[PDB]
Every structure is written in structure tokens, then in C-alpha cells.
Amino acid sequence: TLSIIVAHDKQRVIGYQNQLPWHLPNDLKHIKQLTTGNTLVMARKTFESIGKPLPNRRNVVLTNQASFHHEGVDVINSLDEIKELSGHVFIFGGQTLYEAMIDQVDDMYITVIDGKFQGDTFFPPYTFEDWEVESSVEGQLDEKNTIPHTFLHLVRR
Ligand SMILES: NC(=O)C1=CN([C@@H]2O[C@H](COP(=O)(O)OP(=O)(O)OC[C@H]3O[C@@H](n4cnc5c(N)ncnc54)[C@H](OP(=O)(O)O)[C@@H]3O)[C@@H](O)[C@H]2O)C=CC1
Numbered sequence: 001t002l003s004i005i006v007a008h009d010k011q012r013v014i015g016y017q018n019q020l021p022w023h024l025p026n027d028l029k030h031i032k033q034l035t036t037g038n039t040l041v042m043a044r045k046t047f048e049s050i051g052k053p054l055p056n057r058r059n060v061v062l063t064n065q066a067s068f069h070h071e072g073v074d075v076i077n078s079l080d081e082i083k084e085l086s087g088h089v090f091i092f093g094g095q096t097l098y099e100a101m102i103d104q105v106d107d108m109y110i111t112v113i114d115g116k117f118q119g120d121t122f123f124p125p126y127t128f129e130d131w132e133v134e135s136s137v138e139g140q141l142d143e144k145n146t147i148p149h150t151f152l153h154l155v156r157r
């Protein structure tokens with residue numbers, strides 16, 4: 001299975017200055033629940049924003065830099081190599097990768113953030129006729145989670 005996983009606001013902003021605009025712990029928890037034991041493919045600026053591979057899953061970074069190397073990261077250099085990865089693979093961002101892959105993935109796990117944060121990167125448009133909703137549920141809000149958010153799981157039609 002090849003899956004997108006992303007969080008975006010109502011404007012479909014995902015990022016600003018190579019960081020996430022918002023801090024939403026419940027999104028990070030959701031990330032962890034879905035991806036533990038599986039494989040992440042992240043494009044290079046995303047990897048550099050996060051700064052280190054995430055524990056307890058395989059971290060693959062996509063880059064055209066031949067000398068790119070990092071401890072605990074496998075490196076690929078074209079989108080064709082994504083097909084070759086085994087098991088459940090998550091396209092983990094950023095925009096360049098989401099743009100490239102949205103017409104290729106089997107399904108998408110989207111966290112829709114009920115907010116408007118200014119951004120310099122976006123998640124591509126996606127429509128009702130391409131995607132069917134497998135589930136939609138609202139995240140629980142609390143002292144640490146103050147922005148309303150929906151977890152949406154879409155599967156290609
Ligand atoms: N809200 C969310 O869920 C998420 C948001 N983000 C946000 O997204 C933004 C980053 O997105 P963006 O700026 O588009 O950068 P990306 O994270 O998409 O990284 C782009 C880099 O990836 C490499 N790359 C992309 N396509 C290819 C290819 N076909 N072959 C080889 N290398 C490739 C290149 O690296 P090189 O230059 O090394 O060749 C390129 O410069 C950040 O603000 C981040 O915070 C990221 C993940 C999730």
C-alpha cells in the first residue's frame with residue numbers, strides 16, 4: 001500500500017519557512033499510530049526540517065544530491081524507486097513530493113485543520129469524484145490541542 005499522510009488547513013497550506021505553521025500534538029500522535037513499523041518517504045527539505053529520522057520506522061529520503069548521507073536514513077534519487085520499497089509506504093511530504101505522487105497513491109490519511117495559517121507551500125487540490133471517504137472523525141480538543149481538526153481517510157475510487 002502506498003499512502004499519503006498530510007495535515008493541511010482550510011486553505012490547504014501545509015508549511016511556512018520549512019516548518020509546520022501550527023503545533024498540534026494530536027496530529028503527531030496520529031502520525032505515530034499510522035506509521036510505526038512502516039516506511040516513510042520524505043523529500044529532502046522535509047527531512048531537514050525534522051532534522052533526524054523518526055524512531056521505529058524505516059526512513060527513506062528523496063534527493064538528487066549524490067553525496068547525501070545520514071545515519072539511519074536510506075536515500076533514493078527518483079520517484080521510480082518508491083515503487084521498489086516493500087510493505088506499507090507513506091509519502092510524508094513536502095509539497096514537491098505530494099504534487100508528484102497524489103495521482104499515484106492508493107489512499108490518503110489527511111488531518112484537516114480548522115484554521116487559516118499563512119503558508120508558502122500547499123497540498124494539491126483533491127476532489128470528491130477521485131476519492132471516496134473511508135472514514136472521517138473529529139480529533140479531541142484539550143489544553144494542548146486547541147485547534148479543531150478532522151481525521152479523514154480517503155481511498156482512490
Ligand atoms: N503539514 C504537513 O503535513 C507537512 C508539511 N510539510 C512542509 O512542506 C514544506 C516542504 O516542502 P517543499 O519545499 O516542497 O520541499 P520538499 O520537502 O518537497 O523537498 C524538496 C526537495 O526534495 C528533493 N526532490 C523532490 N523531488 C525529487 C525528485 N524527483 N528526485 C530527487 N529529489 C527530489 C529535492 O532535494 P535536493 O534539493 O536535495 O535535490 C528537492 O529540493 C515545509 O514547509 C514543511 O514544513 C512537510 C511534510 C508534511
Ligand SMILES: COc1cc(Cc2cnc(N)nc2N)cc(OC)c1OC
Pocket residue numbers: 005006007018019020027028031046049050091092093110111
Ligand atoms: C513528526 O514531526 C513532523 C512530521 C511532519 C510530516 C507530517 C505531519 N503531520 C501529518 N499529518 N502528516 C505528515 N506527513 C512534518 C514535520 O515538520 C515539517 C514534523 O516535524 C514537526
